[PDB]
């Protein structure tokens, strides 16, 4: 469980480029399982940014 | 588009995941080659039309 920008959700697969594949997060290349993802803009955002 | 610029690239690094990175874009297709592979690769020349 984490929270992303929207635009980097993409970098969440088996096999990926950019930050998170990078580094914040690896899946293993034959992975077992479900990714799930939902835009949180409503309580993730705050006026002055979160 | 017919007049289309064929800008030849030579003797330069390309860190072709600046346009991975630059999500912006509407498509970052490609053919022939896997877009990751261009990270590891060499060309004798690019052509950017």
């Given at each position: ?24 997060y ?8 479900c ?16 | ?18 346009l ?30």
């Open positions: 469980s984490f929270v992303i920008r929207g635009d980097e959700v993409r970098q969440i697969a088996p096999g990926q480029t950019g930050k998170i594949a990078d580094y914040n690896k899946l293993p290349d034959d992975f077992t399982g990714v799930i993802a939902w835009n949180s803009n409503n309580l993730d955002s705050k006026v002055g940014g979160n | 588009v017919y007049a289309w610029n064929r800008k030849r690239i030579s003797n330069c690094v390309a860190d072709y995941s600046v991975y990175n630059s999500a912006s874009f509407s498509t970052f297709k490609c053919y022939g080659v896997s877009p990751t592979k261009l990270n590891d690769l060499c060309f004798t020349n690019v052509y950017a039309d």
